[PDB]
Design a protein around this ligand. Structure first.
Ligand code: HEM
Length: 184
């Protein structure tokens, strides 16, 4: 009897790895399906997660019409929107993917802020870094990734990208954070 055998990995396919220098990247075709999203506006990215994420964790924790736990999917991605100077607007949207055994008919969220949405599969360029991430940290690694991708046939969107986290705020050791640039 495993306590967290319900936590599963986001299913994607590693198409290529690159960089090999100070900045490495992975090209991933990530599967779509149903998602639980929470939109937060007029709040910094650091403070948006502190309001949005507990709504997501309560949902998969039994705050749904069936009143059942659902496990979860790691990493938990959220969308940030950069200005022309690289800084992040006060807008945020969580993109938590429903576990596979609940992709068929996701339980409906009791909190109306949590919206079950559906998205198609996307391809992302991902770079990784450790520690507890802040707004300045996501920006710096997004820029270091854009720089590495410049000079290659890579093509990515510029109005939006995603940030991913693999560990709860409690787990300090060996954390993983990623920045996903959506391919176009
Ligand atoms: C800063 C953002 C986060 C906040 C504020 C947060 C907050 C919480 C809260 C309030 C719960 C309890 C929910 C409930 O059952 O009522 C919880 C549970 C949990 N969180 Fe998070 N969390 C965050 C990010 C993460 C991340 C990134 C992960 C790892 C992917 C994670 C993993 C978990 C797990 C595994 C549970 C256990 C669920 C349960 O025991 O029912 N959390 N979190």
């Amino acid at each position: 009897n495993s306590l967290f055998g319900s936590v599963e990995t986001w299913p994607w396919q590693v198409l290529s790895t690159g960089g090999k220098e100070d900045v490495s990247y992975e090209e991933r075709a990530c599967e779509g399906g149903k998602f639980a999203t929470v939109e937060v506006t007029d709040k910094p990215v650091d403070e948006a997660l502190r309001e949005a994420m507990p709504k997501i964790m309560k949902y998969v924790g039994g705050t749904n019409d069936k009143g059942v736990g659902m496990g979860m999917t790691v990493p938990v991605s959220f969308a940030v929107f950069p200005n022309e100077d690289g800084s992040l607007q006060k807008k945020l949207k969580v993109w938590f993917r429903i576990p596979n055994q609940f992709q068929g008919s996701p339980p409906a969220p009791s909190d109306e802020s949590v919206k079950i949405e559906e998205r198609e599969g996307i391809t992302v360029y991902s770079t990784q870094f450790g520690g507890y991430a802040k707004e300045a940290d996501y920006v710096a690694h997004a820029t270091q990734l854009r720089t590495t991708l410049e000079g290659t046939p890579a093509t990515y969107q510029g109005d939006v990208y995603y940030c991913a986290g693999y560990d709860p705020p409690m787990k300090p050791y060996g954390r993983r954070n990623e920045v996903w640039l959506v391919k176009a």
